[PDB]
Subunit: 231 residues, 4 copies
């Protein structure tokens, strides 16, 4: 219903994503002896979409991601008219979460967002595993396209009803289980932007890559489903 | 149906929560080499709500948490009349689980609830990660509000039916994956009270914080859903 | 339909349980550096019930456990007539899995079922954590009763349809996340018997405890649901 | 509908499987300190089927596995006519994923697919745990048969509708939690072939075992369900 409801849902769900997924990375993943690892961060990322696509999916469509919104537009499933408002709402909801995360994070002696990366996406020298830019393009392109094909299929008219938030949220856990070592896993321009702002340095300088590549990837995934798989 | 059924359900489900989530913390999380970590405790917390909201959710609403009950009241989804009886039922069911957990725990040489914290919530000197009180307020406030927005949305008239226990239980796993390092993760006054009693010391002295903050947080989350997202 | 179908389902699902849950313990849990821990064994246990209660639940009821069968009888949900045939079917399906597991396990240099315990349940000197017999009784009694209350509730006429295998399977993961350190987690006489036979020693000598306690526990859980929660 | 849609779905979902499950093994499982282990690889494997059986299951049946396709044929659930086209589609979709994975993997200094095994299945000297060929046959035979019985049951006319992708995907996680130490877990000829090609050596020499055994196993599982459990 009336756009305000949908934009609020998109801003709150993207907030959830960044605060949830990035907070687990910043606060819990490398905690001595008991911390949750990349597996726990990956679970946390997927649970934000699972939980918010259940909570507000009926309201806005449950995108929480500029590449989902744009890929859904290329899949002939979303109107170009509401695209820009969704992306701004996602970025704003994302940023507000990184700021609050940054304040929570600063309450521990020795915190340093620039030096730790603040869960930012990067490649080459700023890839966790030491992976080249090409490794990073290929992975984010395949994983963004795949994510969009799952989103498109699971929300298809003929797919089983009500299960979509499970498929989509879990796809995002999968995607994280594969690619954290390569790019810290983006597949989401709004989530990359939100943390890059607070990292302040290299993250802002590679940010472009995490707009171009997930968006291009989400377009391809949406065109693959629309042209090859749907009717 | 008739209040006795609902209060029994609330007492049993909160019992499940404390015994399940706190028992995994006390007995299994730091077990040498094979223990389950914060990730396993977080899974365990979420599974108590998932499993009991399926089992007794049809009976009482499946709250298991004084902040859920109060936030559901502020969301215009629950009557102020049954609020007090739910909270007492939750606290009583919680306490009975900590006592039984404490007796199970005492059957191993060297157990010491005061010195180990008995999975109690704290801040500052009693935060697992060494996080300030402000870090603790912000996290429990955002995570309580978010939890309440998921609860409100997933149980909305227009949300897919029957899936709510999955969304809500998993939200609680998420919430734990983020915040154990900060406050040992409360979001639940009854769960905090239950373990604080048996820790006996500092936990009882910071207990107030874990009534005020999760309740205030759950109120905001419920008012955000009711005023900004629902109709 | 005609008893043969149901007994086959019970024998195959209990086979799945033992081979799945116990195999993960015997083969994968303590594997150097990459092994799955108690958290992975707990996930594996729950996934056997989740997966078989989906596969054959429509056929037999999906019990896979003599304490479930007996507790379902005490809950006024299962006829005393088919009780004995279910329990024998469970034990037989369990034993066949431990034998096949034992043969798979023997294909690695240095395997020794008596000395490793072969994932057997025990207490006192044969508890993983060094827990007393009383610690073991209390935990298996509370966890068996709780399991039975989840089973009873999730399969209640008024509970959401089709979700029961998720609630029940996950409850069993929970139960394992809490109690592996205490008794290696039984809640299942047939699963205890199956591995005890191949351990050959102390496991057979404490086996009685894992018939009495889970059964008594499952009775209480079923009577709690029938008398306090159902109508 | 018209075969092209189904073959595309099978090729894309098997691509997802290999890239998802094998990529997590190659890129993330042994990552220093934070890596995901066998538990995370097992989760990743199951999530590919869960996510694609939701996305394209309505299109092709959601097989993603030559042993599923053939076992579904032996279960009297799939026509022999479309069997060959499915298997070729699976192998092709698998191979394209291993090539892209191999290129992503090569972007890190010191990568070596022959020397690391490239997540390939093997036995004896090429089993992760040092397990004999007999250990490997028994495990892949029981786990393939079991997988096929879950697939058959969960997609039975009388099983709860829409839940099948959850049961099946999770069964595959289970299967991986048990058997990675034994054979690196195949249960899938197409997934074995895809990585064996890029490993280049011993993997190609034992590849036959991972066609014969999962197929034979999937046949038995399908005949067990059709003859003993279905009508
Ligand atoms: C919806 C608003 C966000 C738009 C995406 C911003 C992309 C950031 O681009 C960065 O800015 C360049 C020039 O100022 C940097 O030098 C460059 O490295 C790029 O990442
Ligand atoms: C919607 C918010 C997007 C903000 C992205 C703007 C890009 C910023 O560019 C970087 O700004 C400097 C920060 O002071 C960096 O030091 C520069 O290297 C520059 O790339
Ligand atoms: C929302 C789209 C983000 C802006 C897209 C930038 C594409 C231009 O290509 C690259 O951009 C530069 C950043 O200013 C890089 O430094 C260049 O190497 C160029 O390849
Ligand atoms: C539903 C009953 C539980 C009510 C909440 C109890 C709050 C506990 O407050 C504690 O008691 C103070 C004074 O006795 C302590 O000194 C203080 O630190 C506070 O945490
Ligand atoms: C429903 C049960 C709530 C119980 C909470 C009461 C608060 C207790 O206050 C603390 O009691 C002493 C225990 O003997 C502590 O030592 C004190 O510091 C005091 O804060
Ligand atoms: C159910 C509500 C619990 C009681 C709320 C107490 C609020 C009062 O604020 C703080 O309470 C004291 C505990 O007695 C603290 O020690 C004080 O610092 C005060 O800030
Ligand atoms: C459905 C058949 C399984 C029945 C349960 C068998 C219980 C095993 O009892 C054990 O046998 C005693 C005497 O032979 C042992 O000494 C005793 O320790 C007990 O555990
Ligand atoms: C349905 C199978 C149940 C089998 C349980 C029988 C109990 C066995 O008792 C033990 O048998 C000896 C094995 O040779 C042990 O050494 C004894 O200590 C005895 O307790
Ligand atoms: C299916 C029920 C299993 C048999 C129940 C045995 C109950 C008897 O109590 C205990 O049994 C002995 C085993 O033979 C113990 O060794 C005794 O200590 C006794 O407490
Ligand atoms: C759908 C096409 C894939 C068919 C399965 C190929 C099986 C590979 O067999 C391997 O080839 C032998 C002879 O060339 C090897 O020496 C042998 O070890 C075998 O694994
Ligand atoms: C559809 C693709 C299936 C490809 C499997 C063919 C088997 C290859 O056999 C192996 O080929 C050599 C690679 O150059 C190995 O060195 C040989 O040992 C041989 O077994
Ligand atoms: C699609 C089926 C794959 C081919 C089946 C081969 C079965 C033959 O048995 C074994 O095959 C040889 C591989 O060429 C082995 O090396 C032999 O030991 C033989 O046992």
């Amino acid at each position: 219903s009336h756009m305000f409801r949908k934009l609020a849902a998109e801003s709150f769900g993207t907030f959830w994503l960044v605060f949830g997924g990035s907070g687990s990375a910043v606060l819990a993943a490398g905690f001595p002896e008991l911390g949750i690892g990349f597996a726990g961060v990956a679970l946390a990322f997927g649970l934000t979409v699972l939980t918010m696509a259940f909570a507000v999916g009926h309201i806005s469509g449950g995108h929480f991601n500029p590449a989902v919104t744009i890929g859904l537009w290329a899949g002939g499933r979303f109107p170009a008219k509401e695209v820009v408002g969704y992306v701004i709402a996602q970025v704003v909801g994302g940023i507000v979460a990184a700021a609050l995360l940054y304040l929570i994070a600063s309450g521990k002696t020795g915190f340093d967002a620039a030096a730790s990366g603040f869960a930012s996406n990067g490649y080459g020298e700023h890839s966790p595993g030491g992976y080249s830019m090409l490794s990073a393009l290929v992975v984010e392109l395949v994983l963004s396209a795949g994510f969009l094909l799952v989103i498109h299929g699971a929300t298809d008219k003929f797919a089983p009803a009500g299960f979509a938030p499970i498929a989509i949220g879990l796809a995002l856990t999968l995607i994280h289980l594969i690619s954290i070592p390569v790019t810290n896993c983006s597949v989401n321009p709004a989530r990359s932007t939100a943390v890059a702002i607070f990292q302040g340095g290299w993250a802002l300088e590679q940010l472009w890559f995490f707009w171009v590549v997930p968006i291009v990837g989400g377009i391809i995934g949406g065109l693959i489903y629309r042209t090859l798989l749907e009717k």
